Design a protein around this nucleic acid. Structure first.
Ligand SMILES: [Mg+2]
Ligand SMILES: [Mg+2]
Ligand SMILES: [Mg+2]
Ligand SMILES: [Mg+2]
Ligand SMILES: [Mg+2]
Ligand SMILES: [Mg+2]
Ligand SMILES: [Mg+2]
Ligand SMILES: [Mg+2]
Ligand SMILES: [Mg+2]
Ligand SMILES: [Mg+2]
Ligand SMILES: [Mg+2]
Ligand SMILES: [Mg+2]
Ligand SMILES: [Mg+2]
Ligand SMILES: [Mg+2]
Ligand SMILES: [Mg+2]
Ligand SMILES: [Mg+2]
Ligand SMILES: [Mg+2]
Ligand SMILES: [Mg+2]
Ligand SMILES: [Mg+2]
Ligand SMILES: [Mg+2]
Ligand SMILES: [Mg+2]
Ligand SMILES: [Mg+2]
Ligand SMILES: [Mg+2]
Ligand SMILES: [Mg+2]
Ligand SMILES: [Mg+2]
Ligand SMILES: [Zn+2]
Lengths: 112, 122, 206, 122, 53
RNA sequence: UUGGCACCUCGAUGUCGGCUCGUCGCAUCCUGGGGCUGUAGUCGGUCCCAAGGGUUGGGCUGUUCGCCCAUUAAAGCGGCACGCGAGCUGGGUUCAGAACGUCGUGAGACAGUUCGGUCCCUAUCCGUCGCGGGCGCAGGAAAUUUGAGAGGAGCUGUCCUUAGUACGAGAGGACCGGGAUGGACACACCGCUGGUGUACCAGUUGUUCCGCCAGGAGCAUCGCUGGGUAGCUAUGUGUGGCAGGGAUAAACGCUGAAAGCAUCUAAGCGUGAAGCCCCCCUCAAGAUGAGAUUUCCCAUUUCUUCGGAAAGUAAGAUCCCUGAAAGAUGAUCAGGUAGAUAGGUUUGGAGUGGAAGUGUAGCGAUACAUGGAGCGGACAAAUACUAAUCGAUCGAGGACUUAACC
């Protein structure tokens, strides 16, 4: 819808870099811990990127302390200080759901 | 889109059969529901024809039936429905943006009262 | 109490200054005009009659044209009355702009819910299925029509029938943003109806 | 999204290896428990020589679920498996150590001792 | 399951008040001079009343 | 309830438990209000008013019941053919088989047990839920409406504060008021999270075909597998039961005699419940009591002694046609060239994930480049290219009486 595009255009974060599913990204996520605002690094592989415009979300998967953790973000959230692409993965599909069943070595993405 | 009292594979077969018939004969009589589905499929084949390149020829080839329209005589070689679509039909609609077909309402069929139409290229 | 008529454009989301992410419905409300004021002297109640979207002449008739001629405006797609309004506000032929509302204003959205056609008791009334296995031949059925004694079925035995297309009022929606040049209200959450549905936005009765 | 009969890995140092959810607390007909909710559960598998023994009925807080949690910012968190920590009536763990990551929702509900012992709070 | 009483002639006839055909939507053509369905081709002339074929 | 009687039913009134769907009573389980207390407080006990809403999930057993586990504000008791089998189940009971204990000489039988064992029916009428057609509503129309009347909704926890205050020797620990946040339930919606997505994209096996290669097609559950648009969706999201007002119940009073006192009552004033009536949401003028407002069309022709009749029209509507936001069909709504109604076309978008062809590297499987490529149902915007041509049909002319202006 063209009118919804115009209304939301302002909320689009232009700082967002080009990343694809398969990329390793370091999300600098703002965290309100009690009173003061902290920065908590969440680094993992981009498993999924879905939706359009201000509704677009991506999901980052990492293995923390031998447990898979998936973090889903709005792309244009202002609660992400910085998103940096650490390495470009070589994958063959848009959704890396197969990674949910694989543990280390088997879950390695080749770098480009 | 219409399900024409047919399963998915039956419906694709029907659409391919009628699409080819309309490209080969240029004017066919069928039921209204079938004609209203055929116009969509035939106008997309003619679009591929207008595009003309090998990629579009092969997209059309995946849909059009391997039927012989005629034998021309140069030796005598056959002309296939796909060749007619790309060498005869497509070019005649070079300057016409869309609307390659028209549906004329005919009247109900005796045995089942089905509303019959003429669908024709033009 | 203020009111306006708009079309539901669709849903999206907006980030608040806080940083929170809220779903919004975009209501486009261009071409609202005041057509007629009803008084206790004339009609027996106070109401302002607002005409919403402009309509091609050939789609109108002479009765309609005469009614909007009194307000020096073109035929209107939708005409609705608002009661509980202050008639001192509103002049006949005056435009009613979305700036009658401000961010934080609590409103009641009224519209016609999406049509679902003929629907069974499971979808229409949220009744329970019978078992799907263990020999059951009862699955998506309405349950007993009632006891034996009153040789008949009582009057609110819920049964299959046409489901949606009813007037619905969602109460206490916050207005998130008001864009005058676009004639757009952003309302937190959802309002009844398909896209392009008429939505009546008025100040919350509560 | 944990219900009666849902089994959970115990993410702590107490004897319990696996628990079976007996009851979601806080409501007459409350079906489901999420991260930070307390459940009554029975211990199905124990570590030999542990404090908490098999067959014991205990209270546990859910610290991660496959059904994750939505946050107000519009972000979500989901884990690979459902784990809980066995607690006293005061929200302290029976164990001394907590294993694996733990959801920030715990800090909000006031399970401060668990949040402190956890290696990572996501 | 089964009719409790036979249906009277009156009741049967009332039920059939709506079981009837409508007249076809037709009109006289100019070129033909005979009746035709609207939005159909006229066979008497042998084409669409307006658009020649 | 256990019974008594044998009045309806033996040309059949299906009988236990469960499921589904409830509805009613109040002798009230919870929540609301209150009196007494052997009521300090916190808890309770008991009685009165109160039926608005609410009143859990498991283990065992065919069970009902009951015991138990874990919750809950609470896990109420009853009626409706011990509600509900032309709605379901069929474990039990109440058929033919078989066996045990037991009784019987026996055939067989049971204050008993055990394993197994056909649940039919296309809805005529009323009833119930939806949806059309007709006529009515003293002219014919198009909108906007009032609300007689009806339906819906009605539940409740915990925490913080007041306050460690009142109360109490301590232990413990409030009322009233203010705030936050839940459970269950309901309505709406798909932006989010997910589901589905059989004319979307990709990978892949076997075999057949397109003459062969390459590239494709068929069939194998959509062959299988990984994704997925629109739409439909809950487990997802938004919102609701807010706060009131009026009159009352039990109860508490004020003034106050009868009855120099006393007395809430007789006259007369007030307080006072989740209940009643409003308020909130929805339907609603066939409300034949057929309402109201705004606007449109006007008083035509020929007959009928007479009343009236019929026959062209007005405003307007319909047929027919293109359709979807609507839909079983009707209907509804968007359109019909006074044109974006649908299809096509052109640009996009989601989605998929890198087409074919060609080239390069490799012995080859393959890789890389050209190039976020190619494809791309249903989504968006433009565009009159195709089809919505041309027609026809229906539809007022307004009764009388009286009053008031005039
Ligand atoms: Mg197949
Ligand atoms: Mg619908
Ligand atoms: Mg159920
Ligand atoms: Mg079945
Ligand atoms: Mg009766
Ligand atoms: Mg006798
Ligand atoms: Mg009989
Ligand atoms: Mg009582
Ligand atoms: Mg019974
Ligand atoms: Mg039964
Ligand atoms: Mg029965
Ligand atoms: Mg013997
Ligand atoms: Mg047996
Ligand atoms: Mg039936
Ligand atoms: Mg019938
Ligand atoms: Mg009535
Ligand atoms: Mg969704
Ligand atoms: Mg989706
Ligand atoms: Mg093959
Ligand atoms: Mg080959
Ligand atoms: Mg075969
Ligand atoms: Mg006194
Ligand atoms: Mg009062
Ligand atoms: Mg309440
Ligand atoms: Mg359009
Ligand atoms: Zn003709």
């Amino acid at each position: 819808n063209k009118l919804i595009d115009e209304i939301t255009k302002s909320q689009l974060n232009p700082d967002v870099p080009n990343f694809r599913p398969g990329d390793t990204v370091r999300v600098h996520a703002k965290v309100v811990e009690g009173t003061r605002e902290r920065i908590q690094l969440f680094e993992g592989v981009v498993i999924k990127r879905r939706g359009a415009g201000i509704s677009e979300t991506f999901t980052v998967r990492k293995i923390s302390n031998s447990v898979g953790v998936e973090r889903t973000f709005p792309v244009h959230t202002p609660r992400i200080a910085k998103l940096e692409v650490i390495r470009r993965g070589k994958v063959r599909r848009a959704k890396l759901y197969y990674l949910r069943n694989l543990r280390g070595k088997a879950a390695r993405i080749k770098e480009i | 889109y219409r399900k024409l009292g047919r399963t998915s594979s039956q419906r694709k077969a029907l659409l391919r059969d009628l699409a080819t018939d309309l490209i080969v004969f240029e004017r066919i009589e069928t039921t209204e529901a079938r004609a209203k589905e055929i116009r969509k499929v035939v106008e997309k084949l003619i679009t591929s024809g207008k595009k003309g390149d090998l990629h579009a020829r092969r997209q059309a080839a995946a849909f059009i039936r391997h039927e012989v329209v005629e034998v021309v005589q140069v030796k005598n070689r056959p002309v296939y429905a796909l060749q007619k679509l790309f060498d005869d039909v497509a070019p005649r609609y070079a300057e016409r943006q869309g609307g390659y077909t028209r549906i004329l309402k005919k009247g109900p069929r005796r045995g089942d009262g089905a509303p019959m139409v003429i669908i024709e290229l033009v | 109490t203020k009111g306006i008529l708009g079309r539901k454009v669709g849903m999206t989301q907006v980030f608040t200054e806080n940083g929170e992410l809220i779903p919004v419905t975009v209501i486009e409300a261009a071409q609202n005009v005041v057509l007629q004021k009803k008084t206790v002297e004339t009609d027996g109640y106070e109401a302002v009659q607002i005409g919403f979207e402009d309509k091609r002449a050939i789609l109108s008739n002479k009765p309609e044209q005469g009614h909007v001629a009194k307000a020096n405006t073109t035929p209107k797609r939708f005409i609705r009355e608002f009661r509980d309004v202050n008639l001192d506000e509103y002049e006949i032929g005056a435009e009613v702009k979305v700036d009658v509302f401000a961010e934080g204003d609590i409103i009641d959205a009224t519209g016609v819910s999406k049509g679902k056609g003929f629907q069974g008791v499971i979808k229409r009334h949220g009744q329970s299925r019978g078992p799907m296995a263990h020999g059951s031949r009862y699955h998506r059925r309405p349950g007993s029509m009632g006891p034996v004694a009153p040789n008949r079925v009582f009057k609110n035995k819920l049964l299959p029938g046409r489901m949606g297309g009813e007037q619905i009022t969602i109460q206490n929606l916050e207005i998130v943003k008001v864009d005058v040049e676009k004639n757009v209200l952003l309302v937190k959450g959802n309002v009844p109806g398909a896209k392009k549905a008429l939505v009546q936005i008025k100040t919350a009765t509560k | 999204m944990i219900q009666q009969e849902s089994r959970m890995k115990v993410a702590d140092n107490s004897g319990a290896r696996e628990v079976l959810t007996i009851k979601v607390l806080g409501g007459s007909g409350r079906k489901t428990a999420n991260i930070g909710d307390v459940v009554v559960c029975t211990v199905k598998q124990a570590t030999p020589g542990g404090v908490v023994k098999k067959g014991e009925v205990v209270k546990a807080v859910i610290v991660r679920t496959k059904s994750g949690a939505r946050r107000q910012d519009g972000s979500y968190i989901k884990f690979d498996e459902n784990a809980c920590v066995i607690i006293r009536d005061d929200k302290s763990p029976r164990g001394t150590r907590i294993f694996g990551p733990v959801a920030r929702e715990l800090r909000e509900n006031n399970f401060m001792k668990i949040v402190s012992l956890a290696p990572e709070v996501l | 399951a089964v009719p409790f009483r036979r249906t009277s002639k009156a009741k049967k006839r009332k039920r059939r008040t709506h079981v009837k055909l409508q007249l076809p939507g037709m009109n006289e053509c100019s070129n033909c001079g005979e009746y035709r369905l609207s939005h159909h081709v006229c066979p008497e002339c042998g084409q669409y009343d307006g658009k020649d074929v």
